[PDB]
Write a protein that binds this ligand. Structure first.
Ligand code: CLA
Ligand code: CLA
Ligand code: CLA
Ligand code: CLA
Ligand code: CLA
Ligand code: CLA
Ligand code: CLA
Ligand code: CLA
Ligand SMILES: CC1=C(/C=C/C(C)=C/C=C/C(C)=C/C=C/C=C(C)/C=C/C=C(C)/C=C/C2=C(C)CCCC2(C)C)C(C)(C)CCC1
Ligand SMILES: CC1=C(/C=C/C(C)=C/C=C/C(C)=C/C=C/C=C(C)/C=C/C=C(C)/C=C/C2=C(C)CCCC2(C)C)C(C)(C)CCC1
Ligand SMILES: CC1=C(/C=C/C(C)=C/C=C/C(C)=C/C=C/C=C(C)/C=C/C=C(C)/C=C/C2=C(C)CCCC2(C)C)C(C)(C)CCC1
Lengths: 329, 317
């Protein structure tokens, strides 16, 4: 088959080197937006005023971790933001280095190699090596969860918005029955110590899922209840990231504990006119909104559009290319 | 190759390569010495050294030769003798350039004496490893020359107390040198500058001894391309990155060298094109020497990034 130049990235479906290269380049663009815009939207910051009114977009996430804040919720420094931005710069540098190295120098078909590349070629009809890739990615996401768990033990703990202190969390929960009953108490637990205690359980859960995916492949029913094509696997990933975007918009709307209210903004209100959105209780006159409303709304619309993309790839994968032509006789 | 790619003709000869490079070295030393001698004549002692657009005399003012106490100028004879030694060195390098064009042959394979171990190609790794190690040895020699000029041959100028201070008690631990990546644009002290310079002097002389004493292994020959335009691409990307970070270094650092020789601290401006501007105004509408240097080094570094891009496209397929 042939694809036009307006949409021609489907040629990454069989070529594996470009499949690695374009995605690592995309991650390089994400890390470049993380590093560059932190060091570029720093001149808009003023510690005399608040953080919710000026429209700071990146720096709320850095003050969430509890690096350069103390008693009362005030910012007296920039140097932790400087070192996190700088490690994001050099991480984007090395990640774009590997990206363009795979784009320009590495071969496209990984099965035509001689060293440790022919054992690295993937395709869309195996449950074993794709399960190995899923296991390694689950290991790395669980390692990020381990880093979130160690943030509450290494650098003085996370930031608390109730007690206005960067306190060290040293009380882990030794019971998963509280974790079962959290489905009513979503973003209403009124405790910052239970968030890390829920993070160690899901972190060890991610390690166990990665161990299960490395050790054993899909044992037979996933070949029947699921598909392995690129459009179908793209559909599953886009549905997962759309559910993540919707629950992140809900956490940016209602929580006001992990996100500090004096930095991000006030608790929001769920409204619906033409489209459903979130509005501040304290409006701003200069056609501006807080970081809460901006983040929650933008992640809601992006999660909706990626749910529509998931439905598009699901219709593309399951043979429904163009079958609504038979409406009119 | 007809008159518009003319330097690429002797790229494969590798006998007049040496002549072109020592001619370029002669031109750089000529510009250095002759423009110190030029800017000595157009120098005002009463006015500040940045408002009249002076580059190399403030660059020698960091070394503390022709300056005193309070930001003033004691004399111009150290700048004069430094530019004079640079001019005589450019004369002998241009003499060596005319030597290597005329009396030296087009290829070093015709030579039969003791200089036959100087011929280099684009095929063997050990020769260019020896060249890289000797150049790293000379860079470490320049770093220990700065160490000697800082400790046992003179003092430095500090922007903190505004004097020429012979700096003792340098940085002696490798922890804070590892941590100076976090704050490199603001060194915030000159004792850390000289201590880290002795640290990187030891580091680069260790890399030089490691390079000449150990031949290349072979794990990078299958990854990196061993062509002339490829090594030109690697060095061009290195010097373009160094020029960009040196321009950003010049834009904000007001105490690696003191700012009374350059003017106000430069401010960034990011619009359709990035450029650095001052805060005060000058009646000539001429920007300060720091404002000339940082903007020119940023634009030359960006054009060198594009040149390394073009040479890396030409080196690949
Ligand atoms: C700047 C970073 C960087 C660098 C220098 C390299 C360098 C290399 N990668 Mg690589 N890679 C990188 C980032 C990087 N990668 C990233 C971010 C990814 C995505 C996770 C990959 C994914 C990747 C795969 C999948 C493969 C390589 C392979 C290789 C090797 C080429 C063939 C070879 O020597 O083995 C012969 C080479 C050493 C190939 C290889 O054999 O090494 C394992 C290979 O199959 N890389
Ligand atoms: C977001 C991460 C993630 C992803 C993408 C998958 C994806 C998958 N898992 Mg899975 N799993 C995960 C986390 C994840 N798991 C965790 C955290 C655990 C807990 C240890 C498990 C425990 C688990 C079991 C026990 C099984 C799967 C199986 C499967 C496969 C079939 C789908 C399924 O479960 O239907 C059903 C599919 C590849 C099944 C499989 O591979 O065999 C069909 C299977 O039997 N998973
Ligand atoms: C226009 C592009 C764009 C931009 C600029 C952002 C920007 C942002 N998003 Mg986002 N997002 C986008 C599109 C975009 N998004 C889309 C299209 C979706 C799908 C709907 C999402 C879904 C999404 C979710 C679900 C979340 C964000 C979040 C965020 C914020 C923090 C990101 C972060 O730290 O993750 C960086 C994390 C990673 C890169 C994960 C990998 C970490 C590795 C595994 C660690 C390495 C392990 C090591 C060994 C230890 C940031 C402001 C988060 C937030 O709190 O903000 C609201 C959040 O929860 N986004
Ligand atoms: C992880 C996400 C992801 C990935 C990998 C893909 C991958 C793919 N999609 Mg796709 N898609 C996604 C998300 C994704 N999509 C979402 C979220 C939507 C809903 C909005 C769609 C809607 C969609 C359609 C409708 C079609 C595809 C098609 C394709 C395939 C062809 C290559 C391509 O992208 O065309 C590259 C195409 C472009 C770059 C578009 C051309 C330029 C446009 C005009 C600019 C972008 C418009 C936008 C408004 C710009 C502003 C951005 C805004 C955020 C500010 C390719 C396999 C096509 C297909 O099936 O194969 C032919 C196809 O027809 N996708
Ligand atoms: C020190 C760095 C360096 C080195 C050693 C080289 C070396 C080389 N380049 Mg090159 N290049 C560089 C940087 C460098 N380049 C940069 C930064 C760029 C981007 C602008 C380019 C763009 C470039 C192109 C587009 C081409 C080369 C080519 C070549 C090769 C042949 C050169 C020749 O005789 O024709 C080069 C041409 C001339 C010498 C004559 C025209 C040059 C004009 C007169 C210069 C005018 C600029 C002006 C005086 C400076 C203003 C600055 C201001 C401060 C005053 C040679 C190997 C050619 C090649 O690969 O062969 C096919 C080729 O086509 N280069
Ligand atoms: C710093 C500047 C510089 C230096 C040191 C050189 C040096 C050299 N050039 Mg040259 N060249 C330069 C700038 C420079 N060029 C520029 C700017 C242009 C563009 C007009 C050229 C165009 C050029 C041509 C067309 C040729 C040389 C050639 C040569 C070599 C002389 C060989 C001989 O005597 O016969 C010598 C190594 C010749 C050469 O290498 O042929 C063997 C030759 O044919 N050059
Ligand atoms: C003070 C300036 C000066 C002088 C007088 C010389 C003189 C000489 N050099 Mg020389 N050289 C100089 C600077 C100078 N160089 C510089 C600055 C460099 C580095 C760019 C070189 C790099 C160099 C090499 C690589 C070689 C010479 C060689 C020679 C000798 C020529 C023997 C032969 O067969 O010709 C041909 C001659 C004694 C050759 C030799 O046999 O002596 C070691 C030789 O191979 N020189
Ligand atoms: C700016 C100075 C400089 C330059 C140009 C190089 C250049 C090089 N080094 Mg290197 N190196 C340096 C400083 C430098 N080194 C220092 C200070 C150290 C610490 C002592 C090392 C330690 C080092 C090791 C251990 C190795 C290299 C290797 C290499 C080569 C492979 C490319 C590379 O570095 O991949 C990265 C390349 C020619 C590799 C090599 O020789 O492969 C053939 C290799 O194994 N270098
Ligand atoms: C506690 C806590 C926490 C945690 C959390 C967690 C732990 C979570 C989990 C989560 C989870 C754990 C989830 C789950 C989900 C699930 C789902 C979502 C699924 C889906 C699936 C699918 C979709 C599939 C299906 C199928 C099959 C099976 C076959 C047939 C067909 C189909 C395909 C349909 C936090 C951090 C917040 C903090 C606080 C507290
Ligand atoms: C190879 C070649 C080339 C190149 C060459 C060159 C360019 C050269 C250079 C050369 C040089 C560049 C030289 C220089 C010289 C100079 C001189 C020789 C000067 C003198 C002076 C001095 C040394 C001193 C100083 C002084 C004093 C001390 C006192 C007062 C007065 C005065 C200031 C004078 C060309 C391109 C052409 C062509 C092709 C080939
Ligand atoms: C801060 C400071 C300092 C220091 C400095 C230093 C110590 C530096 C270092 C630096 C460093 C030490 C650097 C490094 C760099 C490196 C580079 C820049 C690289 C890159 C590369 C790339 C990116 C590529 C990649 C690759 C490879 C590697 C292999 C093959 C493949 C490829 C090509 C891909 C001082 C003392 C002066 C004083 C005070 C301030």
């Amino acid at each position: 088959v042939q694809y036009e130049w307006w949409a021609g990235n489907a040629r990454f479906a069989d070529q594996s080197g470009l499949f690695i290269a374009a995605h690592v380049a995309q991650a390089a663009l994400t890390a470049f937006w993380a590093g560059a815009f932190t060091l570029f939207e720093i001149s808009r910051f003023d510690p005399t005023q608040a953080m919710g009114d000026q429209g700071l977009i990146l720096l709320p996430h850095l003050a969430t971790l509890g690096w350069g804040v103390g008693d009362g919720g005030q910012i007296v420094d920039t140097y932790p933001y400087f070192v996190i931005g700088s490690i994001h710069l050099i991480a984007s540098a090395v990640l774009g280095a590997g990206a363009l190295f795979h784009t320009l120098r590495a071969p496209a078909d990984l099965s035509t190699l001689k060293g440790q590349g022919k054992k690295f070629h993937f395709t869309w009809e195996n449950p074993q090596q794709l399960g190995i890739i899923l296991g390694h990615h689950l290991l790395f996401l669980g390692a990020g969860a381990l880093l979130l768990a160690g943030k509450a033990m290494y650098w003085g703990g996370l930031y608390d918005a109730t007690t206005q202190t960067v306190r060290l969390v040293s009380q882990p929960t030794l019971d998963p029955l509280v974790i079962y009953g959290y489905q009513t108490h979503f973003a209403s637990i009124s405790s910052l110590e239970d968030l890390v205690g829920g993070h160690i359980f899901v972190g060890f859960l991610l390690i166990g899922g990665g161990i299960w995916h490395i050790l054993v492949p899909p044992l037979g029913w996933a070949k029947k209840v699921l598909l392995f094509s690129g459009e179908a696997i793209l559909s599953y990933s886009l549905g997962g990231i759309a559910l993540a975007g919707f629950v992140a918009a809900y956490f940016c709307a209602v929580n006001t504990l992990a996100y500090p209210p004096e930095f991000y903004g006030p608790p929001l209100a769920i409204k619906l006119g033409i489209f459903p959105y979130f509005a501040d209780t304290v409006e701003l006159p200069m056609h501006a909104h807080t970081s809460r409303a901006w983040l929650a709304n933008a992640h809601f619309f992006l999660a909706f559009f990626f749910l529509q993309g998931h439905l598009w790839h699901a219709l593309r994968a399951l043979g429904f290319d163009f079958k609504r032509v038979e409406q009119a006789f």
